[PDB]
């Protein structure tokens with residue numbers, strides 16, 4: 005494609021999602037998580053030139069974080085926390101941008117991926133009550 | 145919209161809506177009032193370049209205030225708003241860092257956070273009553 | 286004007302002062318404060334090409350600090366501590382210059398202003414036994 | 426050659442492996458380890474333009490970490506923790522990249538190697554239930 | 566003049582001194598102080614191309630510090646500690662140079678001046694048993 | 706020579722060694738040490754274009770560290786810990802390279818040398834059960 | 846004098862005078878010995894470039910030593926000597942920092958200090974017996 009697909013980490017459960025838009029990049033991303041379950045539960049994404057909110061999961065966590073991304077702003081550091089195996093889950097995400105902005109959502113107590121970097125174009129994975137699995141998508 | 149970038153308004157749906165914005169103008173001063181009692185922002189005042197008027201919203205009942213004065217060439221390079229999410233949400237805190245290494249920290253960051261768009265601060269929008277129900281920043285494009 | 290007026294922070298009390306000189310900038314500023322009251326009590330300013338000391342307040346504090354400012358030296362960082370409201374006071378001042386000089390006077394327990402920056406031209410406010418309120422004045 | 430072979434550290438046990446691809450570099454590396462044994466147990470590698478997973482060891486650890494490596498991204502810092510001698514094992518790996526990405530797997534309580542640096546081309550060693558020994562391979 | 570006169574800080578007591586030499590700058594300065602009185606007691610200065618030691622005060626303190634200054638070396642940071650008022654004294658001096666050298670003499674428990682900076686040309690003040698008052702002198 | 710010989714630090718005991726190779730530099734160095742004796746016991750060196758391991762001492766320590774050195778990589782900081790006198794020993798070595806790699810072996814509770822720096826060409830000293838004395842050798 | 850800068854000799858008037866200097870030579874190595882018992886320097890050794898001789902003064906009775914090796918192009922950019930002042934004075938400590946980021950710290954800094962001239966270290970001068978009574982550094986002009 006014109007795209008780099010980072011590994012989807014977590015389990016095989018939930019309903020698949022792919023959030024990507026032709027000629028579009030992510031302008032906003034929101035992560036919801038709980039202290040009760042130490043999991044991500046819900047993600048929302050907006051793309052440039054598109055008022056629609058693309059949402060997956062169940063927003064039942066007691067915390068959320070939003071990162072807004074300027075048009076020229078890239079991801080220079082990216083860590084996803086997860087529980088591995090078929091019954092796995094995403095537990096946490098840390099993003100750092102080319103403008104020194106960062107967010108930290110959830111927990112990093114089991115497994116980690118340090119992903120590919122670049123301009124964040126989309127996300128892919130599976131979600132039900134929780135985020136079962138998450139992979140980032142970048143421009144080439 | 146072709147001149148402005150609207151950061152997400154974070155917090156609840158309550159209070160009276162406000163938009164503090166002036167044509168050809170940017171914010172020269174912003175004041176945040178907050179309480180240790182409620183751990184909320186209660187009151188915001190803004191001045192714009194070439195305008196002696198003070199634009200105020202909320203109830204200045206907090207025991208703390210912070211003022212940031214912004215030089216004409218000074219931009220926001222880092223911006224975090226703390227809030228309680230949901231319909232009955234509130235803004236709890238704001239942290240701003242400028243291109244000249246100035247910063248302010250008001251209030252509390254214990255629940256939800258937004259790391260916003262950056263640039264030249266043109267205005268603010270949201271809702272306020274006794275508290276700041278919700279706050280969104282506005283930047284020049 | 287030729288001048289930028291920073292917000293006067295503190296209360297409405299004391300006797301007004303405005304210390305400014307045409308074609309002049311502050312060459313020296315002195316702050317007097319007490320541990321007993323945790324307030325500024327007295328300020329003195331000198332201007333270039335002027336031997337006069339312009340003083341306001343009551344110099345009853347147990348501490349003073351002086352900053353001398355070279356002709357080409359600007360203020361790049363300025364924080365004033367104060368108690369807000371009609372019965373407010375200035376409690377503290379921190380200044381940092383373009384030559385890496387700094388001073389710290391008094392206390393920062395309640396409210397703070399981070400002011401405009403530039404060439405320090407004057408001060409304005411009110412003073413009696415204490416510094417009720419203080420605003421810095423810069424060259425435009 | 427076109428390759429720099431870092432010292433294989435650990436013991437003489439397990440089944441030998443050499444994972445390298447001519448005109449290929451590692452795009453992804455995964456380390457599995459346990460708190461129970463404080464050892465690495467399993468490694469997987471993928472090469473650019475190749476969906477096949479090269480795996481060695483037994484993935485029985487309770488933790489894994491993945492590092493994804495951009496095509497232009499090199500290793501600038503590399504530490505392997507191991508137990509020395511014939512009955513040795515690899516206990517840990519830390520990698521830092523030219524883009525400021527890092528991973529840390531396992532434990533560093535006995536012996537350490539700080540390896541050669543450069544573009545990670547492959548791995549070599551021996552593995553059974555555990556990673557007995559590991560050496561990194563770089564482009565010249 | 567060719568000179569910048571920093572404020573003399575401390576009291577009105579002791580015998581006046583001015584140490585300056587035409588076309589000359591300070592090559593060496595020594596400060597003597599006591600733990601008993603927490604005051605400066607004695608200062609000695611040497612100038613380039615001049616073997617004479619210029620001394621004032623009474624060298625009765627239990628500590629001394631010497632700063633030697635290279636011909637091209639300027640003062641980039643200067644703080645004098647003092648007790649304010651007519652019966653004041655100098656308690657301390659801190660100097661930092663353009664070559665990253667620094668000295669710290671005495672105590673800074675009451676009042677402070679952050680002085681003008683530049684090439685140290687001389688000193689002026691009053692001294693008896695102690696240093697009553699001190700001002701630095703720089704080239705323009 | 707073409708060589709700078711750092712001071713051999715430690716005692717006069719053990720069997721002398723000199724590890725150098727014409728037109729060669731050290732590509733790998735290993736230090737073995739014990740918590741029991743808080744001494745270095747054994748050193749191994751490899752040179753570029755030479756598969757031979759040059760070893761001295763007795764590898765009886767419970768720890769080892771290896772530093773691999775890229776062909777263009779120099780030592781920018783070097784500290785050797787030792788026990789002084791005729792019955793002295795080397796207790797520790799810390800090396801930092803031009804690529805930001807470092808190793809720390811053993812203990813620094815007694816004496817220290819901060820050595821010459823540059824391209825590490827060889828080592829010289831004496832060794833028996835312990836490393837009695839160690840000196841580094843650099844290119845001019 | 847047309848080739849050398851003499852830093853002040855600090856400490857007392859006691860011990861046997863020494864001057865360690867070699868024409869067209871600079872210090873390639875310097876060793877300081879000191880004690881926790883007396884909190885003094887006791888012994889100094891110096892080597893010069895192109896000279897296998899060790900120049901030593903004092904009594905090496907301290908429980909600590911440090912050595913600084915100096916590359917031919919390496920200068921001193923920071924230098925502090927700790928001492929006890931007066932006729933019966935002593936050197937208690939030395940701290941050196943080089944143009945290549947090397948440093949040593951020997952002994953104690955509890956009484957008096959000199960921050961010296963900087964440059965290429967050519968030699969040392971002073972007095973020594975059981976202790977280092979006094980020490981002055983010598984630099985190339």
Ligand SMILES: OC[C@H]1O[C@H](O[C@@H]2[C@@H](O[C@@H]3[C@@H](O[C@H]4[C@@H](O)[C@H](O)[C@@H](CO)O[C@@H]4O)O[C@H](CO)[C@@H](O)[C@@H]3O)O[C@H](CO)[C@@H](O)[C@@H]2O)[C@@H](O)[C@@H](O)[C@@H]1O
Pocket residue numbers: 158159160182272273274275276277
């Ligand atoms: O901006 C927020 C709302 O402001 C207006 O509504 C006001 C709001 O004020 C209450 C009030 O709560 C009191 C206690 O009942 C409460 O338990 C305690 C919190 O521990 O705080 C007070 O003692 O004030 C708090 C703190 O400022 C407010 O956060 C809280 O919402 O609601 C009151 C109840 O309806 C109302 O009387 C006030 O006028 C209003 O503009 C609304 O639309 C805003 O959302």
Ligand SMILES: OC[C@H]1O[C@H](O[C@@H]2[C@@H](O[C@@H]3[C@@H](O[C@H]4[C@@H](O)[C@H](O)[C@@H](CO)O[C@@H]4O)O[C@H](CO)[C@@H](O)[C@@H]3O)O[C@H](CO)[C@@H](O)[C@@H]2O)[C@@H](O)[C@@H](O)[C@@H]1O
Pocket residue numbers: 298299300322324412413414415416417
């Ligand atoms: O600039 C500040 C004001 O100065 C003038 O008023 C002065 C003000 O001084 C008081 C005084 O407080 C002390 C006692 O007076 C007080 O009763 C006590 C207990 O409440 O606390 C202190 O001991 O001094 C302090 C320290 O200077 C001041 O902070 C405090 O405001 O009030 C005095 C008596 O009412 C008055 O005599 C003083 O002259 C005046 O210019 C006023 O306008 C200014 O705001």
Ligand SMILES: OC[C@H]1O[C@H](O[C@@H]2[C@@H](O[C@@H]3[C@@H](O[C@H]4[C@@H](O)[C@H](O)[C@@H](CO)O[C@@H]4O)O[C@H](CO)[C@@H](O)[C@@H]3O)O[C@H](CO)[C@@H](O)[C@@H]2O)[C@@H](O)[C@@H](O)[C@@H]1O
Pocket residue numbers: 438439440462552553554555556557
């Ligand atoms: O990679 C290492 C070796 O793997 C293969 O052999 C395996 C090896 O496994 C043992 C085993 O030890 C467990 C118990 O068997 C042991 O008695 C107990 C004592 O404290 O500790 C463990 O519970 O598993 C551990 C954990 O992985 C290993 O560290 C340990 O080596 O040995 C087994 C029998 O001796 C063998 O059956 C296993 O397959 C083999 O390929 C060998 O060459 C490798 O070195």
Ligand SMILES: OC[C@H]1O[C@H](O[C@@H]2[C@@H](O[C@@H]3[C@@H](O[C@H]4[C@@H](O)[C@H](O)[C@@H](CO)O[C@@H]4O)O[C@H](CO)[C@@H](O)[C@@H]3O)O[C@H](CO)[C@@H](O)[C@@H]2O)[C@@H](O)[C@@H](O)[C@@H]1O
Pocket residue numbers: 578579580602692693694695696697
């Ligand atoms: O003859 C000595 C100097 O006289 C003039 O200086 C005066 C001199 O007075 C000192 C002073 O000493 C006391 C304290 O002030 C001092 O701080 C303390 C510790 O040093 O020790 C004494 O207690 O004052 C007493 C007065 O009681 C005098 O007897 C004594 O000579 O020193 C003062 C501090 O520098 C100074 O202020 C005085 O003017 C001066 O003219 C000088 O030439 C003489 O050497």
Ligand SMILES: OC[C@H]1O[C@H](O[C@@H]2[C@@H](O[C@@H]3[C@@H](O[C@H]4[C@@H](O)[C@H](O)[C@@H](CO)O[C@@H]4O)O[C@H](CO)[C@@H](O)[C@@H]3O)O[C@H](CO)[C@@H](O)[C@@H]2O)[C@@H](O)[C@@H](O)[C@@H]1O
Pocket residue numbers: 859860861883973974975976977978
């Ligand atoms: O052979 C005599 C030495 O003479 C010259 O040096 C004298 C010498 O005096 C010391 C000194 O020792 C005590 C303390 O002063 C010392 O600091 C401490 C730790 O070293 O140990 C002793 O307590 O004085 C004693 C007697 O009071 C002498 O016996 C002893 O030798 O060393 C002094 C310090 O350097 C020096 O100032 C003296 O001039 C010198 O020629 C030396 O080589 C001789 O050994």
Ligand SMILES: OC[C@H]1O[C@H](O[C@@H]2[C@@H](O[C@H]3[C@@H](O)[C@H](O)[C@@H](CO)O[C@@H]3O)O[C@H](CO)[C@@H](O)[C@@H]2O)[C@@H](O)[C@@H](O)[C@@H]1O
Pocket residue numbers: 017018019041131132133134135136
């Ligand atoms: O994404 C998680 C899962 O959601 C759906 O299964 C749900 C699951 O909920 C469990 C538990 O797995 C979850 O962590 C906690 C907190 O969110 O809730 C429940 O404890 O399983 C329960 C019961 O089996 C279901 O009620 C619930 O739907 C489903 O879409 C699945 O595919 C997905 O993996």
Ligand SMILES: OC[C@H]1O[C@H](O[C@@H]2[C@@H](O[C@H]3[C@@H](O)[C@H](O)[C@@H](CO)O[C@@H]3O)O[C@H](CO)[C@@H](O)[C@@H]2O)[C@@H](O)[C@@H](O)[C@@H]1O
Pocket residue numbers: 718719720742832833834835836837
């Ligand atoms: O390199 C040290 C020493 O080695 C040889 O002497 C050995 C030495 O062992 C002692 C003690 O020196 C050492 O710290 C520990 C740990 O290695 O072991 C022993 O307690 O001294 C013993 C005497 O008992 C020797 O037999 C032993 O071989 C020798 O090559 C010597 O020259 C060298 O300094």
